[PDB]
Amino acid sequence: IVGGYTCGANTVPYQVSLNSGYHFCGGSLINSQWVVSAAHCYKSGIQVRLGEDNINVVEGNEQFISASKSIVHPSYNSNTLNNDIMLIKLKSAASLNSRVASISLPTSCASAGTQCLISGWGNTKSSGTSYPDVLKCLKAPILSDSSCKSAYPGQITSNMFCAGYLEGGKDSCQGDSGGPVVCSGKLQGIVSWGSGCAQKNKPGVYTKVCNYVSWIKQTIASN
Numbered sequence: 760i761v762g763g764y765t766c767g768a769n770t771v772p773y774q775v776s777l778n779s780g781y782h783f784c785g786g787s788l789i790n791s792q793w794v795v796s797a798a799h800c801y802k803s804g805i806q807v808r809l810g811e812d813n814i815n816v817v818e819g820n821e822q823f824i825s826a827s828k829s830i831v832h833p834s835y836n837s838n839t840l841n842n843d844i845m846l847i848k849l850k851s852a853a854s855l856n857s858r859v860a861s862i863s864l865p866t867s868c869a870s871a872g873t874q875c876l877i878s879g880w881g882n883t884k885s886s887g888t889s890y891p892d893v894l895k896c897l898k899a900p901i902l903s904d905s906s907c908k909s910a911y912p913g914q915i916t917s918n919m920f921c922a923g924y925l926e927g928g929k930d931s932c933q934g935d936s937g938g939p940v941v942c943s944g945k946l947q948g949i950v951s952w953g954s955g956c957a958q959k960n961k962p963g964v965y966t967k968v969c970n971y972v973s974w975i976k977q978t979i980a981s982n
């Protein structure tokens with residue numbers, strides 16, 4: 760997260776870190792057994808780390824649970840990033856409490872202008888590279904589809920939305936991938952892609968979660 764702020768320990772209780780010997784992606788806990796992330800985060804040997812603030816220090820609220828199964832969206836295209844969504848099942852149910860909690864799925868899509876909270880442990884610099892140890896947060900508005908399409912000609916599908924600031928300086932970044940965009944207590948977005956980070960006229964692009972609620976529910980129901 761570039762141009763954001765320190766969230767505060769366990770203030771984003773649905774935020775997960777995906778770990779394969781090191782943090783490599785975010786995700787969102789949606790019930791005791793399932794995490795939503797980006798398909799471009801897919802790999803084998805994932806350990807889901809819940810209750811994290813400092814990802815390099817055991818602070819006392821963590822739950823580490825190995826993934827039993829990952830399900831990449833049937834229509835994920837890694838070239839265009841269309842349908843950039845994946846479900847991860849935990850080998851055991853997380854113990855839910857105030858610091859480890861699920862986030863609600865939307866019942867309808869969010870509108871341009873809605874303020875949302877974007878979070879993760881990704882790069883904090885728009886030029887160089889600096890990875891934070893503690894969770895970073897950004898409050899950002901959803902942008903109009905027309906401005907999103909204008910920013911990224913020929914690249915924005917109906918499964919994507921832009922959020923952030925066209926002026927630059929405030930954005931998600933590398934390492935935030937797969938993490939949440941939460942608006943009025945609903946998971947509306949997943950950190951997906953962008954041209955660099957926090958660049959002028961290049962806002963963050965996010966997977967449009969409301970399109971996938973039916974798929975998420977039925978997948979969970981049978982797995």
Ligand SMILES: N=C(N)c1ccc(C=O)cc1
Pocket residue numbers: 930931932933934935936950951952953954955956957962963964
């Ligand atoms: N919001 C962005 N600028 C952004 C988000 C994720 C990636 C993934 O590597 C790249 C750029």
Ligand SMILES: [Ca+2]
Pocket residue numbers: 811812813814815816817818821
């Ligand atoms: Ca920790």
